[PDB]
Tab-separated table of C-alpha atoms and ligand atoms in Angstrom:
chain	number	residue	atom	x	y	z
O	1	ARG	CA	8.999	12.696	27.778
O	2	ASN	CA	9.261	9.558	29.999
O	3	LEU	CA	7.056	6.456	30.421
O	4	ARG	CA	7.347	6.733	34.250
O	5	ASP	CA	6.304	10.441	34.433
O	6	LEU	CA	3.656	9.924	31.660
O	7	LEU	CA	1.973	7.119	33.719
O	8	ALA	CA	2.624	8.557	37.287
O	9	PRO	CA	-1.091	9.504	37.856
O	10	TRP	CA	-2.248	5.889	37.082
O	11	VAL	CA	0.687	3.347	37.363
O	12	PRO	CA	3.042	4.188	40.285
O	13	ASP	CA	5.786	1.600	39.433
O	14	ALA	CA	6.167	2.165	35.618
O	15	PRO	CA	9.797	1.879	34.368
O	16	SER	CA	11.844	4.986	33.381
O	17	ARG	CA	12.145	5.150	29.535
O	18	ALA	CA	12.749	8.191	27.276
O	19	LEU	CA	9.949	8.427	24.629
O	20	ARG	CA	9.996	10.176	21.218
O	21	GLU	CA	6.479	10.262	19.602
O	22	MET	CA	3.150	8.667	20.631
O	23	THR	CA	1.423	6.639	17.826
O	24	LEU	CA	-1.587	4.245	17.536
O	25	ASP	CA	-0.222	3.005	14.139
O	26	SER	CA	2.359	0.120	14.453
O	27	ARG	CA	3.473	0.864	10.804
O	28	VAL	CA	4.997	4.353	11.687
O	29	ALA	CA	6.034	3.405	15.301
O	30	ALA	CA	9.839	4.234	15.121
O	31	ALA	CA	12.887	3.689	17.434
O	32	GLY	CA	12.218	5.316	20.860
O	33	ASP	CA	8.387	5.690	20.223
O	34	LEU	CA	5.414	4.948	22.512
O	35	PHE	CA	3.141	2.457	20.717
O	36	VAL	CA	-0.466	2.585	22.001
O	37	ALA	CA	-2.316	-0.709	21.282
O	38	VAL	CA	-6.119	-0.024	21.313
O	39	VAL	CA	-9.190	-2.229	20.501
O	40	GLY	CA	-11.745	-0.568	18.124
O	41	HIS	CA	-14.449	-1.900	15.711
O	42	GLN	CA	-12.832	-5.139	14.259
O	43	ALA	CA	-9.233	-3.767	14.817
O	44	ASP	CA	-7.045	-4.958	17.794
O	45	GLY	CA	-3.644	-3.128	17.927
O	46	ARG	CA	-2.273	-5.615	20.561
O	47	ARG	CA	-1.956	-7.984	17.492
O	48	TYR	CA	0.822	-5.603	16.194
O	49	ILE	CA	2.860	-5.519	19.523
O	50	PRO	CA	5.573	-7.942	18.178
O	51	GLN	CA	5.989	-5.740	15.005
O	52	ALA	CA	6.141	-2.511	17.143
O	53	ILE	CA	8.788	-4.212	19.396
O	54	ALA	CA	10.859	-5.398	16.322
O	55	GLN	CA	10.771	-1.761	14.975
O	56	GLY	CA	12.436	-0.655	18.283
O	57	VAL	CA	9.687	1.217	20.247
O	58	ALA	CA	10.805	2.245	23.769
O	59	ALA	CA	7.430	1.136	25.303
O	60	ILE	CA	3.804	0.024	24.668
O	61	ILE	CA	0.574	0.921	26.501
O	62	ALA	CA	-2.149	-1.691	25.679
O	63	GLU	CA	-5.884	-2.434	26.219
O	64	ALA	CA	-6.022	-4.682	29.365
O	65	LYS	CA	-9.430	-6.162	28.235
O	66	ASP	CA	-9.195	-10.035	28.313
O	67	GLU	CA	-5.336	-9.995	28.465
O	68	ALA	CA	-4.345	-8.243	31.758
O	69	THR	CA	-5.268	-6.267	34.943
O	70	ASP	CA	-5.424	-2.393	34.837
O	71	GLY	CA	-1.858	-1.081	35.443
O	72	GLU	CA	-0.279	-4.551	34.920
O	73	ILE	CA	3.418	-4.038	33.912
O	74	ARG	CA	4.873	-6.810	31.671
O	75	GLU	CA	8.231	-6.832	29.768
O	76	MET	CA	8.542	-8.393	26.225
O	77	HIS	CA	12.029	-8.525	24.528
O	78	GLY	CA	13.242	-5.879	27.062
O	79	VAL	CA	10.304	-3.482	26.121
O	80	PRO	CA	7.890	-2.426	28.949
O	81	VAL	CA	4.253	-3.267	28.052
O	82	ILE	CA	1.799	-1.579	30.482
O	83	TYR	CA	-1.907	-2.643	30.390
O	84	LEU	CA	-4.796	-0.139	31.062
O	85	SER	CA	-8.581	-0.851	31.255
O	86	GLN	CA	-10.851	1.399	29.062
O	87	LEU	CA	-7.879	2.716	27.017
O	88	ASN	CA	-10.215	4.405	24.422
O	89	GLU	CA	-11.847	6.499	27.242
O	90	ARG	CA	-8.405	7.405	28.782
O	91	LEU	CA	-6.496	8.087	25.495
O	92	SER	CA	-7.269	11.843	25.442
O	93	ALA	CA	-5.860	12.244	29.019
O	94	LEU	CA	-2.777	10.071	28.204
O	95	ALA	CA	-2.010	12.159	25.053
O	96	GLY	CA	-2.675	15.436	26.976
O	97	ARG	CA	-0.051	14.526	29.599
O	98	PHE	CA	2.314	13.309	26.800
O	99	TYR	CA	2.024	16.682	24.962
O	100	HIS	CA	2.274	18.926	28.101
O	101	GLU	CA	-1.493	19.680	28.396
O	102	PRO	CA	-1.792	22.058	25.400
O	103	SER	CA	-5.444	23.054	26.243
O	104	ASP	CA	-4.086	24.499	29.607
O	105	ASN	CA	-1.558	26.624	27.608
O	106	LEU	CA	-4.063	28.401	25.286
O	107	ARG	CA	-7.759	29.516	25.480
O	108	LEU	CA	-9.629	26.658	23.687
O	109	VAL	CA	-13.204	27.270	22.454
O	110	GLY	CA	-15.219	24.231	21.312
O	111	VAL	CA	-18.096	24.737	18.797
O	112	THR	CA	-20.672	21.917	18.383
O	113	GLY	CA	-23.877	21.672	16.288
O	114	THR	CA	-25.123	20.547	12.853
O	115	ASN	CA	-24.485	23.917	11.040
O	116	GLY	CA	-22.378	27.092	11.472
O	117	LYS	CA	-19.338	25.431	13.237
O	118	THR	CA	-16.901	26.481	10.440
O	119	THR	CA	-18.137	30.099	10.420
O	120	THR	CA	-18.499	30.362	14.233
O	121	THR	CA	-14.910	28.996	14.810
O	122	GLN	CA	-13.458	31.313	12.075
O	123	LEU	CA	-15.231	34.337	13.689
O	124	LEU	CA	-13.930	33.313	17.180
O	125	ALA	CA	-10.343	32.957	15.812
O	126	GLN	CA	-10.520	36.256	13.811
O	127	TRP	CA	-12.146	38.371	16.583
O	128	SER	CA	-9.781	37.158	19.348
O	129	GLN	CA	-6.762	37.848	17.055
O	130	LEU	CA	-8.087	41.424	16.375
O	131	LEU	CA	-7.992	41.883	20.217
O	132	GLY	CA	-4.314	40.761	20.313
O	133	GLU	CA	-4.377	36.920	20.542
O	134	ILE	CA	-2.400	34.700	18.143
O	135	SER	CA	-5.401	32.599	17.015
O	136	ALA	CA	-5.762	29.139	15.410
O	137	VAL	CA	-8.581	26.887	14.138
O	138	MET	CA	-9.036	23.134	14.194
O	139	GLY	CA	-11.897	21.828	11.987
O	140	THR	CA	-13.296	20.763	8.564
O	141	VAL	CA	-11.201	23.229	6.386
O	142	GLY	CA	-8.154	21.980	8.442
O	143	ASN	CA	-5.864	22.999	11.380
O	144	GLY	CA	-3.439	25.951	11.738
O	145	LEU	CA	-2.803	29.561	12.778
O	146	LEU	CA	-5.292	31.943	11.027
O	147	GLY	CA	-4.203	32.317	7.327
O	148	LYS	CA	-2.081	29.105	7.476
O	149	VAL	CA	-4.752	26.352	7.754
O	150	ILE	CA	-3.375	22.901	6.577
O	151	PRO	CA	-6.241	20.699	5.180
O	152	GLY	CA	-8.454	11.636	13.535
O	153	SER	CA	-7.859	10.177	17.072
O	154	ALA	CA	-7.623	11.511	20.707
O	155	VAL	CA	-3.805	11.426	20.181
O	156	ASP	CA	-3.845	13.426	16.871
O	157	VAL	CA	-6.115	16.075	18.535
O	158	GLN	CA	-3.646	16.597	21.441
O	159	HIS	CA	-0.601	16.456	19.054
O	160	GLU	CA	-2.127	19.077	16.668
O	161	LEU	CA	-3.040	21.398	19.626
O	162	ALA	CA	0.555	20.974	21.015
O	163	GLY	CA	1.871	21.936	17.524
O	164	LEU	CA	-0.290	25.112	17.586
O	165	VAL	CA	0.979	25.954	21.158
O	166	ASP	CA	4.561	25.418	19.791
O	167	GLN	CA	3.844	27.913	16.933
O	168	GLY	CA	2.758	30.586	19.543
O	169	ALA	CA	-1.092	30.179	19.426
O	170	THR	CA	-2.782	31.735	22.535
O	171	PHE	CA	-6.371	30.997	21.254
O	172	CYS	CA	-7.852	28.051	19.346
O	173	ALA	CA	-11.426	27.695	17.961
O	174	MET	CA	-12.129	23.961	17.457
O	175	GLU	CA	-15.059	22.404	15.560
O	176	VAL	CA	-16.230	19.426	17.701
O	177	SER	CA	-18.113	16.707	15.698
O	178	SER	CA	-20.905	14.736	17.497
O	179	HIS	CA	-18.947	11.584	16.430
O	180	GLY	CA	-15.620	13.027	17.829
O	181	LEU	CA	-17.306	13.723	21.235
O	182	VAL	CA	-18.911	10.191	21.399
O	183	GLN	CA	-15.535	8.527	20.485
O	184	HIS	CA	-13.902	10.404	23.472
O	185	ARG	CA	-11.623	12.327	21.018
O	186	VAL	CA	-11.794	15.556	23.134
O	187	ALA	CA	-12.434	13.788	26.484
O	188	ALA	CA	-9.569	15.519	28.494
O	189	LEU	CA	-9.405	18.938	26.682
O	190	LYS	CA	-9.864	21.957	28.995
O	191	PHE	CA	-12.395	23.970	26.937
O	192	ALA	CA	-12.488	27.630	28.063
O	193	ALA	CA	-15.953	27.766	26.396
O	194	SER	CA	-18.435	25.454	24.575
O	195	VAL	CA	-20.735	26.909	21.875
O	196	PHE	CA	-23.943	25.201	20.608
O	197	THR	CA	-25.121	26.498	17.193
O	198	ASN	CA	-28.153	24.173	16.418
O	199	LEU	CA	-29.381	20.490	16.081
O	200	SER	CA	-31.088	19.232	12.803
O	201	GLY	CA	-38.878	8.633	23.603
O	202	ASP	CA	-35.974	8.699	21.062
O	203	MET	CA	-35.402	12.357	22.199
O	204	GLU	CA	-35.203	11.111	25.880
O	205	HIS	CA	-32.340	8.546	25.264
O	206	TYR	CA	-30.463	10.888	22.815
O	207	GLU	CA	-30.543	13.720	25.411
O	208	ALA	CA	-29.608	11.328	28.317
O	209	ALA	CA	-26.610	9.999	26.316
O	210	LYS	CA	-25.454	13.602	25.400
O	211	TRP	CA	-26.019	15.017	28.927
O	212	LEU	CA	-23.875	12.143	30.376
O	213	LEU	CA	-21.123	12.794	27.728
O	214	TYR	CA	-21.015	16.582	28.465
O	215	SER	CA	-21.181	15.925	32.275
O	216	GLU	CA	-17.806	14.091	31.767
O	217	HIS	CA	-16.149	17.018	29.836
O	218	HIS	CA	-14.562	20.341	30.943
O	219	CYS	CA	-17.016	22.503	28.906
O	220	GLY	CA	-16.078	25.833	30.591
O	221	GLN	CA	-18.535	28.693	29.764
O	222	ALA	CA	-21.585	27.315	27.882
O	223	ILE	CA	-22.799	29.605	25.038
O	224	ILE	CA	-26.127	28.282	23.616
O	225	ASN	CA	-28.328	29.398	20.688
O	226	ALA	CA	-31.782	29.939	22.337
O	227	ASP	CA	-33.436	30.072	18.840
O	228	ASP	CA	-32.876	26.262	18.638
O	229	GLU	CA	-35.525	24.075	20.409
O	230	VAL	CA	-32.724	21.784	21.763
O	231	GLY	CA	-30.630	24.887	22.690
O	232	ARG	CA	-33.549	26.074	24.946
O	233	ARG	CA	-33.978	22.641	26.645
O	234	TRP	CA	-30.247	22.756	27.613
O	235	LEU	CA	-30.474	26.465	28.711
O	236	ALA	CA	-33.468	25.350	30.888
O	237	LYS	CA	-31.009	23.028	32.819
O	238	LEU	CA	-27.835	25.307	32.764
O	239	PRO	CA	-28.423	28.502	34.800
O	240	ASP	CA	-24.793	29.764	34.174
O	241	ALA	CA	-25.013	29.252	30.360
O	242	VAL	CA	-25.298	32.379	28.106
O	243	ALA	CA	-28.560	32.578	26.052
O	244	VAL	CA	-28.108	34.035	22.525
O	245	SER	CA	-31.159	35.008	20.421
O	246	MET	CA	-32.048	36.952	17.284
O	247	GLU	CA	-35.769	35.773	17.403
O	248	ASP	CA	-36.957	36.966	20.905
O	249	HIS	CA	-36.196	33.679	22.884
O	250	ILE	CA	-34.381	35.417	25.834
O	251	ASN	CA	-36.582	34.798	28.933
O	252	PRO	CA	-35.609	37.711	31.294
O	253	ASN	CA	-37.307	36.003	34.370
O	254	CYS	CA	-34.240	33.611	34.565
O	255	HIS	CA	-31.731	36.508	35.376
O	256	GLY	CA	-29.093	34.553	33.388
O	257	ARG	CA	-26.506	36.087	31.050
O	258	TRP	CA	-27.981	36.874	27.631
O	259	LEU	CA	-27.390	38.547	24.264
O	260	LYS	CA	-30.092	39.236	21.674
O	261	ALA	CA	-30.291	41.097	18.352
O	262	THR	CA	-33.134	43.664	18.809
O	263	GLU	CA	-33.161	44.652	15.093
O	264	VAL	CA	-31.254	43.515	11.961
O	265	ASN	CA	-31.107	45.585	8.719
O	266	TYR	CA	-29.947	43.194	5.898
O	267	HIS	CA	-28.453	45.663	3.320
O	268	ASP	CA	-26.418	45.587	0.037
O	269	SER	CA	-22.973	45.042	1.768
O	270	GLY	CA	-23.850	43.187	5.024
O	271	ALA	CA	-26.065	43.430	8.119
O	272	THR	CA	-26.448	46.196	10.699
O	273	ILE	CA	-26.991	44.262	13.964
O	274	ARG	CA	-28.425	46.176	16.949
O	275	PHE	CA	-28.262	44.107	20.148
O	276	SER	CA	-28.773	44.182	23.939
O	277	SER	CA	-26.840	42.021	26.468
O	278	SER	CA	-26.072	41.668	30.189
O	279	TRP	CA	-22.676	43.220	29.222
O	280	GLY	CA	-24.228	46.308	27.503
O	281	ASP	CA	-25.890	47.212	24.161
O	282	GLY	CA	-24.359	48.024	20.803
O	283	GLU	CA	-24.571	48.109	17.031
O	284	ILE	CA	-22.286	45.990	14.762
O	285	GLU	CA	-21.690	46.494	10.997
O	286	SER	CA	-21.264	42.831	9.836
O	287	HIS	CA	-19.755	42.231	6.359
O	288	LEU	CA	-21.354	38.712	6.416
O	289	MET	CA	-24.582	37.802	4.559
O	290	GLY	CA	-27.826	36.111	5.740
O	291	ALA	CA	-29.660	35.381	9.054
O	292	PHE	CA	-27.535	32.295	9.976
O	293	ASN	CA	-24.354	34.468	9.828
O	294	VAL	CA	-26.042	36.964	12.252
O	295	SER	CA	-26.592	33.974	14.619
O	296	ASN	CA	-22.958	32.747	14.159
O	297	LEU	CA	-21.586	36.286	14.833
O	298	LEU	CA	-23.820	36.741	17.961
O	299	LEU	CA	-22.576	33.344	19.226
O	300	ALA	CA	-18.905	34.448	18.666
O	301	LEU	CA	-19.628	37.778	20.453
O	302	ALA	CA	-21.462	36.168	23.461
O	303	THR	CA	-18.524	33.695	23.813
O	304	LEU	CA	-15.803	36.414	23.813
O	305	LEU	CA	-17.864	38.588	26.274
O	306	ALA	CA	-18.272	35.476	28.555
O	307	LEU	CA	-14.449	34.941	28.413
O	308	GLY	CA	-13.955	38.571	29.621
O	309	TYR	CA	-13.062	40.367	26.335
O	310	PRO	CA	-14.350	43.942	26.850
O	311	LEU	CA	-17.499	44.918	24.807
O	312	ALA	CA	-15.883	48.242	23.633
O	313	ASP	CA	-12.829	46.403	22.126
O	314	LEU	CA	-15.141	43.762	20.469
O	315	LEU	CA	-17.445	46.540	19.025
O	316	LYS	CA	-14.335	48.461	17.742
O	317	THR	CA	-13.015	45.440	15.724
O	318	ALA	CA	-16.365	43.902	14.529
O	319	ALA	CA	-16.142	45.643	11.059
O	320	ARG	CA	-12.888	43.708	10.330
O	321	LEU	CA	-14.580	40.263	10.670
O	322	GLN	CA	-14.485	38.583	7.227
O	323	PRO	CA	-16.615	35.867	5.617
O	324	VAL	CA	-15.245	32.337	5.143
O	325	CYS	CA	-13.734	32.708	1.601
O	326	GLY	CA	-16.404	31.768	-1.036
O	327	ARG	CA	-19.138	31.392	1.652
O	328	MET	CA	-21.907	33.984	1.004
O	329	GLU	CA	-18.948	36.307	0.147
O	330	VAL	CA	-20.102	39.853	-0.833
O	331	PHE	CA	-18.524	42.067	-3.520
O	332	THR	CA	-19.980	45.613	-3.820
O	333	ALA	CA	-18.940	48.553	-6.004
O	334	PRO	CA	-20.071	52.156	-6.431
O	335	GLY	CA	-23.364	51.976	-8.432
O	336	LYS	CA	-23.020	48.258	-9.439
O	337	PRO	CA	-25.279	45.330	-8.378
O	338	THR	CA	-24.350	43.464	-5.129
O	339	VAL	CA	-22.630	40.171	-6.080
O	340	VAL	CA	-22.358	37.177	-3.689
O	341	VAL	CA	-19.930	34.289	-4.436
O	342	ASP	CA	-21.021	31.038	-2.674
O	343	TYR	CA	-19.800	27.418	-3.057
O	344	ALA	CA	-23.463	26.081	-2.940
O	345	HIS	CA	-23.436	23.010	-5.323
O	346	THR	CA	-26.517	21.020	-3.978
O	347	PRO	CA	-30.287	21.748	-4.031
O	348	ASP	CA	-30.342	22.380	-0.234
O	349	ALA	CA	-27.191	24.635	-0.226
O	350	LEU	CA	-28.516	26.595	-3.289
O	351	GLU	CA	-31.925	27.169	-1.625
O	352	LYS	CA	-30.249	28.393	1.657
O	353	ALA	CA	-27.827	30.657	-0.292
O	354	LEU	CA	-30.748	32.223	-2.298
O	355	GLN	CA	-32.926	32.648	0.859
O	356	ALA	CA	-29.883	34.403	2.554
O	357	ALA	CA	-29.179	36.614	-0.541
O	358	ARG	CA	-32.913	37.586	-0.815
O	359	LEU	CA	-32.815	39.293	2.660
O	360	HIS	CA	-30.213	41.789	1.259
O	361	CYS	CA	-32.053	42.263	-2.108
O	362	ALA	CA	-34.325	45.354	-2.664
O	363	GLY	CA	-34.471	44.682	-6.465
O	364	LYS	CA	-34.140	41.404	-8.441
O	365	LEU	CA	-32.232	38.303	-7.254
O	366	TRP	CA	-30.124	36.713	-10.051
O	367	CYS	CA	-28.728	33.158	-9.758
O	368	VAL	CA	-25.740	32.198	-12.020
O	369	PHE	CA	-24.989	28.465	-11.710
O	370	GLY	CA	-24.407	25.120	-13.403
O	371	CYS	CA	-23.708	21.477	-12.445
O	372	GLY	CA	-20.590	19.320	-12.697
O	373	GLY	CA	-20.197	16.958	-15.658
O	374	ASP	CA	-19.460	13.183	-15.334
O	375	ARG	CA	-21.132	13.204	-11.838
O	376	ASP	CA	-24.606	12.376	-10.442
O	377	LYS	CA	-27.260	13.880	-12.752
O	378	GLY	CA	-29.978	13.692	-10.040
O	379	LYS	CA	-29.317	17.167	-8.521
O	380	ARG	CA	-29.575	18.951	-11.963
O	381	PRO	CA	-33.400	19.263	-12.315
O	382	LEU	CA	-33.663	19.809	-8.479
O	383	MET	CA	-31.213	22.801	-8.689
O	384	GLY	CA	-33.147	24.074	-11.746
O	385	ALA	CA	-36.446	24.031	-9.732
O	386	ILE	CA	-34.746	25.844	-6.754
O	387	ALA	CA	-33.203	28.601	-9.023
O	388	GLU	CA	-36.640	29.160	-10.704
O	389	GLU	CA	-38.475	29.355	-7.309
O	390	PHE	CA	-35.987	31.290	-5.055
O	391	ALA	CA	-34.455	33.660	-7.685
O	392	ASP	CA	-36.124	36.176	-10.050
O	393	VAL	CA	-33.646	35.413	-12.884
O	394	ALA	CA	-31.896	32.023	-13.366
O	395	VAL	CA	-28.725	32.256	-15.518
O	396	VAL	CA	-27.781	28.579	-16.307
O	397	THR	CA	-24.144	28.190	-17.385
O	398	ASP	CA	-21.246	25.700	-17.168
O	399	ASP	CA	-19.541	24.452	-13.940
O	400	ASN	CA	-16.744	21.864	-14.557
O	401	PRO	CA	-18.513	20.058	-17.457
O	402	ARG	CA	-15.382	17.778	-17.678
O	403	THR	CA	-15.890	15.355	-20.686
O	404	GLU	CA	-19.738	15.656	-20.709
O	405	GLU	CA	-21.433	17.644	-23.537
O	406	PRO	CA	-21.861	21.006	-21.698
O	407	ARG	CA	-25.361	21.777	-23.158
O	408	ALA	CA	-26.668	18.267	-22.106
O	409	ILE	CA	-25.963	19.331	-18.486
O	410	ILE	CA	-27.883	22.617	-19.047
O	411	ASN	CA	-30.816	20.620	-20.562
O	412	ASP	CA	-31.014	18.389	-17.391
O	413	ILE	CA	-31.138	21.574	-15.257
O	414	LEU	CA	-33.830	23.238	-17.473
O	415	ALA	CA	-35.944	19.994	-17.409
O	416	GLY	CA	-36.536	20.592	-13.645
O	417	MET	CA	-38.177	24.023	-14.265
O	418	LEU	CA	-41.919	24.779	-14.820
O	419	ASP	CA	-40.913	27.467	-17.379
O	420	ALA	CA	-37.453	26.666	-18.860
O	421	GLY	CA	-38.185	29.506	-21.374
O	422	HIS	CA	-37.829	32.053	-18.478
O	423	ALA	CA	-34.202	30.868	-17.654
O	424	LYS	CA	-31.296	32.692	-19.409
O	425	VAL	CA	-28.749	30.153	-20.731
O	426	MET	CA	-25.200	31.420	-21.441
O	427	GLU	CA	-22.113	29.271	-22.035
O	428	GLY	CA	-18.821	30.429	-21.115
O	429	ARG	CA	-19.231	30.693	-17.300
O	430	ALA	CA	-17.201	33.976	-17.436
O	431	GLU	CA	-19.687	35.304	-20.103
O	432	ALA	CA	-22.731	34.194	-17.967
O	433	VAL	CA	-21.335	35.957	-14.874
O	434	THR	CA	-20.625	39.070	-16.999
O	435	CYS	CA	-24.180	38.952	-18.479
O	436	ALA	CA	-25.747	38.908	-14.940
O	437	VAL	CA	-23.426	41.537	-13.441
O	438	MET	CA	-23.605	43.958	-16.458
O	439	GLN	CA	-27.473	43.678	-16.860
O	440	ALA	CA	-28.421	43.663	-13.121
O	441	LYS	CA	-29.742	46.984	-11.618
O	442	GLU	CA	-27.935	48.851	-8.770
O	443	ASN	CA	-30.228	47.371	-6.025
O	444	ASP	CA	-30.252	43.838	-7.526
O	445	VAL	CA	-28.239	40.964	-6.029
O	446	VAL	CA	-26.420	38.381	-8.215
O	447	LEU	CA	-25.620	35.048	-6.539
O	448	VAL	CA	-22.745	33.231	-8.376
O	449	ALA	CA	-23.105	29.675	-6.959
O	450	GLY	CA	-21.141	26.413	-7.214
O	451	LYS	CA	-17.410	27.303	-6.914
O	452	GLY	CA	-16.959	29.607	-3.883
O	453	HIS	CA	-13.144	29.587	-3.301
O	454	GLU	CA	-12.216	27.202	-6.183
O	455	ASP	CA	-9.911	28.779	-8.817
O	456	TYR	CA	-10.459	26.348	-11.787
O	457	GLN	CA	-12.980	25.345	-14.535
O	458	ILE	CA	-12.515	21.665	-15.607
O	459	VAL	CA	-13.335	21.578	-19.401
O	460	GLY	CA	-12.430	18.106	-20.789
O	461	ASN	CA	-9.336	16.970	-18.802
O	462	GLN	CA	-7.972	20.607	-18.633
O	463	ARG	CA	-8.008	22.396	-15.221
O	464	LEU	CA	-8.265	25.943	-16.718
O	465	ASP	CA	-7.369	29.147	-14.746
O	466	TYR	CA	-10.803	30.569	-13.756
O	467	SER	CA	-12.103	32.229	-10.565
O	468	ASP	CA	-15.680	33.477	-9.931
O	469	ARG	CA	-14.175	35.786	-7.199
O	470	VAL	CA	-11.621	37.223	-9.730
O	471	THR	CA	-14.210	37.519	-12.584
O	472	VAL	CA	-16.672	39.305	-10.221
O	473	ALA	CA	-13.939	41.551	-8.639
O	474	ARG	CA	-12.624	42.560	-12.145
O	475	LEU	CA	-16.224	43.370	-13.390
O	476	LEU	CA	-16.991	45.454	-10.236
O	477	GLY	CA	-13.662	47.420	-10.428
O	478	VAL	CA	-12.334	45.938	-7.126
O	479	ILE	CA	-9.625	43.444	-5.947
O	480	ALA	CA	-10.338	39.726	-5.128
T	1	LIG	C1	-22.839	19.655	33.356
T	1	LIG	C2	-22.497	20.480	32.259
T	1	LIG	C3	-23.020	20.135	31.033
T	1	LIG	C4	-22.782	20.939	29.921
T	1	LIG	N1	-22.330	22.195	29.904
T	1	LIG	O1	-22.426	22.586	28.578
T	1	LIG	C5	-22.908	21.571	27.850
T	1	LIG	C6	-23.130	21.727	26.427
T	1	LIG	C7	-24.005	22.960	26.187
T	1	LIG	C8	-24.099	23.191	24.687
T	1	LIG	C9	-22.692	23.498	24.190
T	1	LIG	C10	-21.944	22.158	24.283
T	1	LIG	C11	-21.760	21.857	25.759
T	1	LIG	N2	-23.138	20.526	28.602
T	1	LIG	C12	-23.836	19.013	30.896
T	1	LIG	C13	-24.101	18.249	32.020
T	1	LIG	N3	-23.628	18.544	33.248
């Protein structure tokens, strides 16, 4: 790592200087480091150049705006200070070159959209690893090789992807936030593929701004959900993009690449997905629950087919795809009710989780849930009303009551129902889960909402050992 080589594409006469790490933060800038002095909202890092220098950085690259000409080389206290115009726009490319272009040294798939990025990225990482990749994720749950995810600037993005390349990753599925894209945080990444899940003359400006942004990126293969109105508008303008549909939105007149679910059977342990595609037809046994997870899986499949992974190998490994832990996570047992563990802890998330569960439910849908104590009370009646409408049996119990009188929380929930008398109340969460699971019929579905992956019940100040997954697994005669 050398200032001269680093800047060779832009500043021909930059001085030779060994460089350790690249940092935007003058406070951690250490001996031998490259300090990058950027102007943001309020903040001007050029202010902290003297401090960086005094802490012994080998060199500084700085915003040229109002101070200098693009590629102007100064020298302060023996330290080279090189000025660049539009540093925020160019920071991805600078960090890419610094970290040896990590997106050129693995297959990077970007996933964008309002919902399904976490699931779609986890399915991409899992499926590619089943076919022999060493796969990683970068996103909301964190960064890391599959199974070792550790819970943000253009520099941090390149540095983290370099770290994954260093650990042997050959494939990375990356959640791309709308805000990340607009702030040029992935501006110089070589995406092998770009996946659109869904969105939500204003619409004219919004679209113009996004089209310009994406015209500037290396998107690779575009994989677009054609069931989304905005998805279709972009497929209209991208003849090489892959159309993915589970609601009959493939227009065969276009002769583009396509993949569509022809029929879906939502059953007690998953979904049987029959599909047709320009690669061939097939049937997948998904162990994931709900319509949105069919969409997410079909997007992962279309992407991997577009990248050249053979259909027969993808079909052969589909049954090993797993849910995101505690996200619509199914537990089934010989002649026991189907039980789904989901983290849903808001009115909207509860409604979606119940609507998803219902598709798989031939009998009665049960909803076991509560609301957190010493937190906003507003959601309590709203989650009551949702459980009453979208389930057949509401079991209201405790969920981290903390210092709040547990029954007061249950009262607030019941107050949102038309017929509170129809709700089952049971305190002890473990007892309420047992009550549902032991009373439910064989073709009933019990949704245990609010905790998902969390392994604790906060009663008072005590963080007690408790897992919904473990309680459910133990009651069904299976292993969490
Ligand atoms: C050339 C290419 C592009 C482009 N390619 O794909 C995308 C998006 C599609 C949805 C998935 C996210 C990327 N935009 C835009 C303008 N000019």
